[PDB]
Design an enzyme around this catalytic site. Sequence first.
Site, PDB file in Angstrom:
ATOM      1  N   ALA A 225       0.751  -1.275   0.158  1.00 21.06           N
ATOM      2  CA  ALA A 225      -0.048   0.098  -0.028  1.00 21.06           C
ATOM      3  C   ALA A 225       0.882   1.168  -0.123  1.00 21.06           C
ATOM      4  O   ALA A 225       0.604   2.363  -0.612  1.00 21.06           O
ATOM      5  CB  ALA A 225      -1.070   0.118   1.184  1.00 21.06           C
ATOM      6  N   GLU A 228       4.846   0.382  -3.089  1.00 20.35           N
ATOM      7  CA  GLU A 228       4.587  -0.117  -4.490  1.00 20.35           C
ATOM      8  C   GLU A 228       3.632   0.783  -5.089  1.00 20.35           C
ATOM      9  O   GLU A 228       3.866   1.137  -6.181  1.00 20.35           O
ATOM     10  CB  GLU A 228       4.192  -1.637  -4.447  1.00 20.35           C
ATOM     11  CG  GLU A 228       5.187  -2.627  -3.850  1.00 20.35           C
ATOM     12  CD  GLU A 228       6.488  -2.769  -4.917  1.00 20.35           C
ATOM     13  OE1 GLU A 228       6.423  -2.195  -6.054  1.00 20.35           O
ATOM     14  OE2 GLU A 228       7.234  -3.604  -4.480  1.00 20.35           O
ATOM     15  N   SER A 230       2.739   4.020  -4.027  1.00 21.92           N
ATOM     16  CA  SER A 230       3.503   5.075  -4.198  1.00 21.92           C
ATOM     17  C   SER A 230       4.517   5.151  -5.468  1.00 21.92           C
ATOM     18  O   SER A 230       4.602   6.173  -6.233  1.00 21.92           O
ATOM     19  CB  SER A 230       4.199   5.700  -3.233  1.00 21.92           C
ATOM     20  OG  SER A 230       3.257   5.773  -2.032  1.00 21.92           O
ATOM     21  N   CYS A 337      -7.158   6.097   2.431  1.00 13.57           N
ATOM     22  CA  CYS A 337      -6.079   5.932   2.466  1.00 13.57           C
ATOM     23  C   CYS A 337      -5.238   6.603   3.882  1.00 13.57           C
ATOM     24  O   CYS A 337      -5.243   7.608   4.138  1.00 13.57           O
ATOM     25  CB  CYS A 337      -5.273   6.636   1.648  1.00 13.57           C
ATOM     26  SG  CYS A 337      -3.320   6.318   1.500  1.00 13.57           S
ATOM     27  N   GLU A 346       5.000  13.143  -0.349  1.00  9.12           N
ATOM     28  CA  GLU A 346       5.921  12.562  -1.243  1.00  9.12           C
ATOM     29  C   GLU A 346       5.924  12.629  -2.660  1.00  9.12           C
ATOM     30  O   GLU A 346       6.919  13.226  -3.268  1.00  9.12           O
ATOM     31  CB  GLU A 346       5.794  11.050  -1.297  1.00  9.12           C
ATOM     32  CG  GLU A 346       6.262  10.287   0.165  1.00  9.12           C
ATOM     33  CD  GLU A 346       5.765   8.937   0.017  1.00  9.12           C
ATOM     34  OE1 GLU A 346       5.202   8.444  -0.906  1.00  9.12           O
ATOM     35  OE2 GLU A 346       6.459   7.976   0.732  1.00  9.12           O
TER      36      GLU A 346
HETATM   37  C1  HEM Z   1       0.277   7.745  -4.230  1.00  5.94           C
HETATM   38  C2  HEM Z   1       0.180   6.920  -3.209  1.00  5.94           C
HETATM   39  C3  HEM Z   1      -1.133   6.193  -2.703  1.00  5.94           C
HETATM   40  C4  HEM Z   1      -2.241   6.181  -3.326  1.00  5.94           C
HETATM   41  C5  HEM Z   1      -2.827   6.383  -4.762  1.00  5.94           C
HETATM   42  C6  HEM Z   1      -3.075   5.345  -2.229  1.00  5.94           C
HETATM   43  C7  HEM Z   1      -4.202   5.091  -2.376  1.00  5.94           C
HETATM   44  C8  HEM Z   1      -4.953   4.156  -1.521  1.00  5.94           C
HETATM   45  C9  HEM Z   1      -6.287   3.555  -1.936  1.00  5.94           C
HETATM   46  C10 HEM Z   1      -7.272   3.881  -2.951  1.00  5.94           C
HETATM   47  C11 HEM Z   1      -6.622   3.002  -0.658  1.00  5.94           C
HETATM   48  C12 HEM Z   1      -7.990   2.167  -0.672  1.00  5.94           C
HETATM   49  C13 HEM Z   1      -8.894   3.074  -0.185  1.00  5.94           C
HETATM   50  C14 HEM Z   1     -10.324   2.204  -0.053  1.00  5.94           C
HETATM   51  O1  HEM Z   1     -10.174   0.936  -0.412  1.00  5.94           O
HETATM   52  O2  HEM Z   1     -11.272   2.390   0.212  1.00  5.94           O
HETATM   53  C15 HEM Z   1      -5.750   3.176   0.263  1.00  5.94           C
HETATM   54  C16 HEM Z   1      -5.507   2.491   1.382  1.00  5.94           C
HETATM   55  C17 HEM Z   1      -4.365   2.609   2.231  1.00  5.94           C
HETATM   56  N1  HEM Z   1      -3.072   3.398   2.089  1.00  5.94           N
HETATM   57 FE1  HEM Z   1      -2.799   4.143   0.428  1.00  5.94          FE
HETATM   58  N2  HEM Z   1      -2.375   5.179  -1.184  1.00  5.94           N
HETATM   59  C18 HEM Z   1      -1.128   5.702  -1.233  1.00  5.94           C
HETATM   60  C19 HEM Z   1       0.170   5.972  -0.369  1.00  5.94           C
HETATM   61  C20 HEM Z   1       0.105   5.316   0.637  1.00  5.94           C
HETATM   62  C21 HEM Z   1       1.064   5.382   1.520  1.00  5.94           C
HETATM   63  C22 HEM Z   1       2.387   6.263   1.371  1.00  5.94           C
HETATM   64  C23 HEM Z   1       0.724   4.777   2.889  1.00  5.94           C
HETATM   65  C24 HEM Z   1       1.340   4.654   4.229  1.00  5.94           C
HETATM   66  C25 HEM Z   1       2.613   5.523   4.320  1.00  5.94           C
HETATM   67  C26 HEM Z   1      -0.325   4.205   2.759  1.00  5.94           C
HETATM   68  C27 HEM Z   1      -1.418   3.253   3.501  1.00  5.94           C
HETATM   69  C28 HEM Z   1      -2.496   2.987   3.203  1.00  5.94           C
HETATM   70  C29 HEM Z   1      -3.135   1.966   4.205  1.00  5.94           C
HETATM   71  C30 HEM Z   1      -2.715   1.621   5.692  1.00  5.94           C
HETATM   72  C31 HEM Z   1      -4.513   1.746   3.669  1.00  5.94           C
HETATM   73  C32 HEM Z   1      -5.440   0.638   4.185  1.00  5.94           C
HETATM   74  C33 HEM Z   1      -6.479   1.809   5.111  1.00  5.94           C
HETATM   75  C34 HEM Z   1      -7.697   0.822   5.342  1.00  5.94           C
HETATM   76  O3  HEM Z   1      -7.955  -0.323   4.679  1.00  5.94           O
HETATM   77  O4  HEM Z   1      -8.464   1.199   6.346  1.00  5.94           O
HETATM   78  N3  HEM Z   1      -1.069   4.526   1.121  1.00  5.94           N
HETATM   79  N4  HEM Z   1      -4.798   3.900  -0.354  1.00  5.94           N
END
Ligand code: HEM
Length: 388
Positions: A225, A228, A230, A337, A346
Amino acid sequence: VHIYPFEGEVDGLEIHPKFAELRETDPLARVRLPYGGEGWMVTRYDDVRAANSDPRFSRAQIGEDTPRTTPDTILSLDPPEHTRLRRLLSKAFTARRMGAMQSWLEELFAGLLDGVERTGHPADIVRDLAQPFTIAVICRLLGVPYEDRGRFQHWSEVIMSTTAYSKEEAVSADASIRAYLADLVSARRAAPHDDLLGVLVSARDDDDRLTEDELITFGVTLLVAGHETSAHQLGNMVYALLTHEDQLSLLREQPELLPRAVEELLRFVPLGNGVGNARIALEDVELSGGTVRAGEGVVAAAVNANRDPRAFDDPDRLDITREKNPHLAFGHGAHYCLGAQLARMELRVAIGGLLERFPGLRLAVPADQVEWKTGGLFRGPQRLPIAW
Ligand code: HEM
């Protein structure tokens, strides 16, 4: 009933036209994926939003007749399990803790740029900047020392790249990751550490805490998450800028646009392959095209919602000046997210850093010479050469 994959493959960052066709004429489209029985596909912003956030849809209670493209994670939990997990995780993922990383991001990216600049053009955005940047950030969050960044980068690649590595290789990499994280967690249980993983180990919700298994599993989730996702998003965003020269010029001439440019690039750039994971209805839900009954599966990709002209003006044109940008690239609702603030930081650091160092930045080869990945969860260039 529409068969996915649709006829005709897309190159680069192109969106398959069928999604737009379905959005206007078949908003509750019956679809048949490679595995499972029939499901529904929704493509309008409101419906995609509902599918991915309304608590009447489940991520956990998937089954055999669930439409899907393939034959533990917080991403797959529902309330109330999800709610408990999220409350604990939010003791570490705070605005204060994420925002304090700004300076360190800037110096990290500046060091990577220095090396690229010393070596001379052409460089590869993917290998030389994006991948090492994002893995370093996740390694800082986990307490992984500098010397093991390469190891994590590799193990992450193995478990993520499902078409390039075998099941046995993925099992071995996952086992290695988990053994390393187990040692990190064990050190963090002996004495409090101040990295994000140490904060998670110390987090408490009354008497409640994350178990070792939850901590270790969350470390794995953070590689996919956080790193990869990012890394691929950044490479794809740079490709988009470098192929939209008028927009890139505008951003150089008007650098205060950077935050809006980043949000617009989040809205615009496809990341996955346009389907996403089925959600199963726990109860009847009325959507724009009709009613989804309890038990039926729904696929809904944010990328299609983000091109819906009901939510964005002239949605298929990149416009970095857009002020109102309620895109779904980070989701909406309970699963929003957990890293969005840090992801935004970032992307601003990287894109802002790149443009300031290299006024002459350009693709080093014509676009028709960029090879794109074909399997796996992510779209992206195999290599993205730049010159300046
Ligand atoms: C360009 C970067 C990123 C994008 C486009 C992105 C996008 C997303 C999306 C679409 C989800 C799912 C939302 C959903 O299912 O309803 C998600 C979940 C998540 N993201 Fe990211 N994300 C990014 C970067 C990151 C980074 C940098 C971290 C941590 C340092 C992170 C941690 C998480 C976590 C922990 C979840 C799970 C939250 C949950 O299920 O309750 N993400 N992200």
